[PDB]
Swiss-Prot record, chain A:
Role noted for this protein: Binds as a heterodimer with protein bS6 to the central domain of the 16S rRNA, where it helps stabilize the platform of the 30S subunit.
Record-level Gene Ontology MF annotations: small ribosomal subunit rRNA binding; structural constituent of ribosome
Disulfide bond annotation, renumbered to this chain: none
Any one of the GO BP annotations: translation
Protein's UniProt name: Small ribosomal subunit protein bS18B
UniProt keyword list: Ribonucleoprotein, Ribosomal protein, RNA-binding, rRNA-binding
Keyword RNA-binding: yes
Cellular component aspect of the GO annotation: cytosolic small ribosomal subunit
Signal peptide: none
Gene: rpsR2
Family label: Belongs to the bacterial ribosomal protein bS18 family.
Subunit structure: Part of the 30S ribosomal subunit. Forms a tight heterodimer with protein bS6.
Domain of life: Bacteria
From Swiss-Prot, chain B:
Entry-linked Pfam families: Ribosomal_S7
Name of the coding gene: rpsG
GO terms classed as biological process: translation
Annotated organism of origin: Mycolicibacterium smegmatis (strain ATCC 700084 / mc(2)155)
Highest taxon of source: Bacteria
The protein's name: Small ribosomal subunit protein uS7
Family membership noted in the UniProt record: Belongs to the universal ribosomal protein uS7 family.
Entry-linked InterPro entries: Ribosomal_uS7, Ribosomal_uS7_bac/org-type, Ribosomal_uS7_CS, Ribosomal_uS7_dom, Ribosomal_uS7_dom_sf
Self-association and partners: Part of the 30S ribosomal subunit. Contacts proteins S9 and S11.
Curated annotation (Swiss-Prot), chain C:
Oligomeric and partner information: Part of the 30S ribosomal subunit. Interacts with proteins S7 and S18. Binds to IF-3.
Region (Disordered): 97-115
Stretch of the intact protein here: 23 to 137 of 138
Molecular-function GO terms, alphabetical: rRNA binding; structural constituent of ribosome
Function: Located on the platform of the 30S subunit, it bridges several disparate RNA helices of the 16S rRNA. Forms part of the Shine-Dalgarno cleft in the 70S ribosome.
Species classification: Bacteria, Bacillati, Actinomycetota, Actinomycetes, Mycobacteriales
Keyword set includes Ribosomal protein: yes
Entry's Gene Ontology cellular component terms: ribonucleoprotein complex; ribosome
Name of the featured protein: Small ribosomal subunit protein uS11
UniProt keyword list: Ribonucleoprotein, Ribosomal protein, RNA-binding, rRNA-binding
Family per similarity comment: Belongs to the universal ribosomal protein uS11 family.
Domain of life: Bacteria
RNA sequence: GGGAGACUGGAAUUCCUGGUGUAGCGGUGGAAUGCGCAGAUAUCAGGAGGAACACCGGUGGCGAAGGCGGGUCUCUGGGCAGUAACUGACGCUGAGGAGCGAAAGCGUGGGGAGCGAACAGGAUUAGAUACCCUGGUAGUCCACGCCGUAAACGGUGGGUACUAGGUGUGGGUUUCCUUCCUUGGGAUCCGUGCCGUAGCUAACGCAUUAAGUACCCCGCCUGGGGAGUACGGCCGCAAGG
């Protein structure tokens, strides 16, 4: 299917501070993209979702613009 | 009509007028198969119209037909377990049929002491736009318009 | 008054549709409803009634000086596309289309299911 | 409700009992009853365990409702006929309360013969 | 298993509960 | 998403206040009760409060079961893998007994937005103590305690060993294609599904997660009603168990 860009040897760490790294993972409506569309592993999907929620909590990402 | 459409009867052109419409009219006024009497009635009415107005009878007959020809009609439709009066477009043949039937009937309930006179008066007023068949077209168009909300299905 | 640019708000529910042309600051200058154009009961949930209400509201905005509008559609789809089309067809220039339907984040309990 | 009974042979008092029992069914019918006929017959053969046969016919606004029973005497046959007719009238109702559960519901949930077909665009969704 | 058995048991239970409800104060006063 | 505590975020519903703004709104298969003309519905701004946490989010994870997902911090339980350093049979089951145990319900004190038994109207109906509509009280929520039941179900007690495979998916260790990026592939341990042998079963089906082949311990059954009822007893504030 597709690649978990985080399991690779160059997998950047997932943080709630780097906004662009998260913006690539949310749809144009601000919703979190599904795992099958993204293709990352379950642990990284959980990390991404938690980071997105944390970023929203500090007004770094819109709550569904 | 479960297995498909049925063929139409190609009725012949009239000899003394050469028009399809007059044969359709005589077949509409026909009763019990007395075709000769129906032809006499229609020819007499056309001649009365020609005498009254002074011109060709077929042209005024066509004018009356266009004046009473409908375009929009209402049929009951059952969609999703519910019935409503849905306005529906009328095909040309059904419009001609409806116009002729209306003309013949409303002439049958006139008060001119003879069917030839009743028919002639009805066709003349339909030509001028005052017949009861013209009225009937007015109410059918009104009813079709008043139910326009249901035209989407 | 004279408001050259305004906003159009269309609310299409399952049994009605309300159009209100609005000054961009949020003030309503002309509104038309499905029941305002002669429909009542179940008749006013039809797309034709939505078209009529949209046209009436568009006219009532037009003599007020409104020339260009942007719409904010909302509600379950009943006559939304019809309403926008009637807005355009009544002499109003439609700039942008935006769907703003209130979407709860799982708050408040819906009523019990009908049977 | 007026009922005409066409018995035969020997069945004393069967006509009155049948008339009185059947006439009580008019209120159960949801549409006016245009006609009502009852026929009582008895089997000649003594070997028949249920000799008496009762039949009914009601014209419920053009809808024909009929039933037939067998019994050992007139009273039992009439009572069983009344029960059968009541069941038939219950199944015939056809007013709104009787067809509110069969009208298709929802939008996409459930499918029925008269359910509204889904609208499909020209191009494949993709 | 058929639901008929459940129906018989539930009707017995419902009747018993109705009987208990109908005689609550009488039982309290006799006991 | 194992549990407990504390703090905290945003969307939405409702209400209140103030603008714009008019004559309908709401509801249904169709309507009517109802709300509004004393300015409703709609739209904008501001404010108060309560409850539930969209997307992630699945036949995916965790828990003995009931069950558990907004975020953060604090405290805390279990599991798995590898090494195999340590002890050296310390194991298994478990009558009674103790603990936990959805929802509803009960007590005391708060809270109460939405939903909503009861209760009111409206409608349908021959009749509607109903289904549908408009309202709506307990309750739902919190603290501390009772209750001790469920289709508490995989309708399958626990432990152990053995008996063809194929293919998904979750957690971890490792050899070889090696770009070593790649579900590369293999091997292995622990889960969780589907399909299928042998075998078993009345059949349906189960089938390495057994309902197969065996061993240890526990619970239970002995035709259907009467009846999980009466009587007596124990527990409970009561309902009742």
């Amino acid at each position: 299917t597709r690649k978990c860009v985080f399991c690779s040897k160059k997998g950047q760490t997932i943080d709630y501070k780097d906004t662009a790294l998260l913006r690539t993972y949310i749809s144009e409506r601000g919703k979190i993209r599904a795992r099958r569309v993204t293709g990352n592993c379950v642990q990284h999907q959980r990390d991404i979702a938690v980071a997105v929620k944390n970023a929203r909590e500090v007004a770094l990402l819109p709550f569904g613009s | 009509p479960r297995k498909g459409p049925a063929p139409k009867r190609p009725l012949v052109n009239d000899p003394v007028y050469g028009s399809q419409l007059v044969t359709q009219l005589v077949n509409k006024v026909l009763l019990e198969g007395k075709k000769s009497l129906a032809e006499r009635i229609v020819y007499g009415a056309l001649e009365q119209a020609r005498e009254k107005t002074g011109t060709d009878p077929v042209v005024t007959l066509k004018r009356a037909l266009d004046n009473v020809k409908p375009a929009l009609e209402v049929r009951s439709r059952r969609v999703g377990g519910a019935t409503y009066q849905v306005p529906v477009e009328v095909r040309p043949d059904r419009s001609t049929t409806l116009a002729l039937r209306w003309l013949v009937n409303f002439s049958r309930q006139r008060r001119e002491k003879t069917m030839v006179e009743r028919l002639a008066n009805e066709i003349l007023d339909a030509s001028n736009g005052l017949g009861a068949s013209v009225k009937r077209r007015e109410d059918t168009h009104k009813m079709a318009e008043a139910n326009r909300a249901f035209a989407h299905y | 008054k004279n408001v050259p640019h305004g906003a159009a708000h269309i609310k299409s529910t399952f049994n009605n549709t309300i159009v209100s042309i609005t000054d961009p600051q949020g003030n309503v200058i002309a509104w038309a409803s499905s029941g305002h154009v002669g429909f009542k009961g179940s008749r006013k949930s039809t797309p034709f009634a939505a078209q009529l209400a949209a046209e009436n509201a568009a006219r009532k905005a037009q003599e007020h000086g409104v020339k260009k509008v942007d719409v904010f559609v909302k509600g379950p789809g009943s006559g939304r596309e019809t309403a926008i089309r009637s807005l355009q067809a009544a002499g109003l220039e439609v700039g942008t289309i935006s769907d703003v339907t209130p979407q709860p984040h799982n708050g408040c309990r819906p009523p019990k299911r009908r049977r | 409700m007026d009922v005409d009974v066409s018995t035969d042979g020997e069945l004393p008092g069967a006509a009155e009992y049948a008339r009185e029992k059947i006439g009580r069914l008019s209120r159960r019918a949801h549409r006016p009853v245009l006609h009502a006929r009852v026929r009582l017959t008895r089997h000649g053969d003594p070997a028949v365990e249920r000799p008496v046969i009762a039949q009914a016919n009601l014209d419920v606004n053009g809808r024909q409702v009929r039933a037939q029973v067998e019994g050992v005497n007139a009273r039992e046959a009439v009572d069983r006929l009344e029960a059968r007719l009541r069941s038939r009238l219950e199944r015939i109702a056809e007013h709104w309360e009787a067809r509110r559960g069969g009208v298709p519901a929802e939008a996409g949930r459930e499918w029925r013969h008269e359910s509204e077909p889904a609208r499909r665009p020209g191009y494949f969704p993709r | 298993g058929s639901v008929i058995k459940k129906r018989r048991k539930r009707m017995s239970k419902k009747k018993h509960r109705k009987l208990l409800r109908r005689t609550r104060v009488q039982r309290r006063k006799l006991g």
